[PDB]
Amino acid sequence: AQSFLNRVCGVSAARLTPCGTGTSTDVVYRAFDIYNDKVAGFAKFLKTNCCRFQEKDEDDNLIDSYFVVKRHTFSNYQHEETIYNLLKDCPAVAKHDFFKFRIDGDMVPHISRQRLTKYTMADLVYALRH
């Protein structure tokens, strides 16, 4: 399994510890602000297109930082790419990292958002209004 887990620890702070499962995704109860064409609102869905790694610390204590790796369409993989490649500057951008990895015989793409935070401004504002 690890070569993956290895291979998404990229180059930095190899102290990871998948509080996920193995190489499968995760299931989180997170409160989005959503508005496609059909649904809408500010509500708490069950999201699951993400593998989630809790980065640990020297002395091997946990520590609030995360690597969130999402897996989606090739085409969309390109869009995200060319965009990120346009905009890798204004420091308010979490430093992404793209790659292609294999699961089985499948060359599934993967995007790796680096060092985030367990929550998001959503969970704050939401679970303070409601």
Binding site: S75, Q78, E81, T82, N85
Partner: protein, 174 residues
């Protein structure tokens, strides 16, 4: 006035060290000082650039007898039936590394055929061009949604030209 003929196709805008650019336009404005180019030891030459190049704007019409002018005029194609066969192709542009080039994907004629093929193109290299295979996507037009299942299943050029010249060699051989 500049050409889409041999117009560069990759997004990299850093001019070529003119010892790696076969034309007086593909030189960065670091060498052109009053229409002349001055050698620069301040930076060495580059060996890391793989850009596809456009293949448009031809307008082929030299004038010699040693080749017969391929394009036939109004009558010389009306007179000669038992040769009429269609020719049309569909194309697309690349995604990440480059864009701005037209390359074929499906080829149709008068014969009830529509050949599939993966796109490839002349990438520029510090030694010559290579004939490289690049990621492809159809144009964003929604009427090209029919063109979705054609990019991940096409064919290279060698087998394609064999099969095409052989469709020729059994349908037009008569």
């Amino acid at each position: 006035n500049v050409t889409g003929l041999f117009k560069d196709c990759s997004k990299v805008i850093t001019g070529l060290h003119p010892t790696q650019a076969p034309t007086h336009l593909s030189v960065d404005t670091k060498f052109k000082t009053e229409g002349l180019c001055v050698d620069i030891p301040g930076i060495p030459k580059d060996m890391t650039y793989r850009r596809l190049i456009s293949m448009m704007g031809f307008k082929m019409n030299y004038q010699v007898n040693g080749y017969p002018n391929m394009f036939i005029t109004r009558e010389e194609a009306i007179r000669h039936v038992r040769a009429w066969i269609g020719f049309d192709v569909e194309g697309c542009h690349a995604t990440r590394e480059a864009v701005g080039t037209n390359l074929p994907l499906q080829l149709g004629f008068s014969t009830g055929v529509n050949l599939v093929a993966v796109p490839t193109g002349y990438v520029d290299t510090p030694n010559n061009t290579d004939f490289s295979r690049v990621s492809a996507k159809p144009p964003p037009g929604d009427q090209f949604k029919h063109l979705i299942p054609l990019m991940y299943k096409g064919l290279p050029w060698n087998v394609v030209r064999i099969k095409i010249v052989q469709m020729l060699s059994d349908t037009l051989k008569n």
